[PDB]
Amino acid sequence: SMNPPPPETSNPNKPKRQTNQLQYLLRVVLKTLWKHQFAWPFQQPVDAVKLNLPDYYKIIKTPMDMGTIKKRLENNYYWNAQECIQDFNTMFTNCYIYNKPGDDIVLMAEALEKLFLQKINELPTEE
Numbered sequence: 001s002m003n004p005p006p007p008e009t010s011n012p013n014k015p016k017r018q019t020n021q022l023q024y025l026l027r028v029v030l031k032t033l034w035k036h037q038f039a040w041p042f043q044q045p046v047d048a049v050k051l052n053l054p055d056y057y058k059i060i061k062t063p064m065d066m067g068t069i070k071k072r073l074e075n076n077y078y079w080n081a082q083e084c085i086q087d088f089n090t091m092f093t094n095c096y097i098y099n100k101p102g103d104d105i106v107l108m109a110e111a112l113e114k115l116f117l118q119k120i121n122e123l124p125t126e127e
């Protein structure tokens with residue numbers, strides 16, 4: 001059961017912007033989660049072949065990970081902050097959909113999500 005191609009991170013025809021909110025999502029939100037001790041399972045797309053999870057991409061149909069988010073922010077791929085915030089939320093929700101309460105991977109996502117929520121609570125107003 002192969003891995004699908006990763007989510008898109010480059011598209012020259014996509015309208016995109018650099019807003020102060022998107023700068024905050026890279027410089028504060030992404031950077032804080034990325035350096036966390038629990039970040040590594042989320043730093044790249046799930047390799048469901050190497051992890052022996054043949055059902056993963058049959059259940060998770062909108063995959064997302066912080067490696068993809070990092071590339072999108074570095075490429076200024078987004079139009080607005082909500083688009084990027086949705087990518088984070090997709091990543092967390094996907095984790096809770098696929099896994100069981102109290103699993104190690106869920107505990108790791110919950111720690112990252114708590115920090116995520118604390119940082120987006122202080123999202124600056126758009127200038």
Ligand SMILES: Cc1cnc(Nc2ccc(C3CCN(C)CC3)c(F)c2)nc1Nc1ccc(Cl)c(NS(=O)(=O)C(C)(C)C)c1
Binds near residue numbers: 040052098099104
């Ligand atoms: C982002 C994400 C979401 N969902 C899952 N679900 C998952 C569920 C079960 C397993 C094993 C399957 C064979 N079983 C024998 C043990 C468990 C699995 F490999 C992964 N994985 C994720 N990313 C990830 C990336 C690298 C690794 Cl090494 C792991 N492994 S892990 O066990 O979750 C960890 C060591 C606690 C981090 C996960």
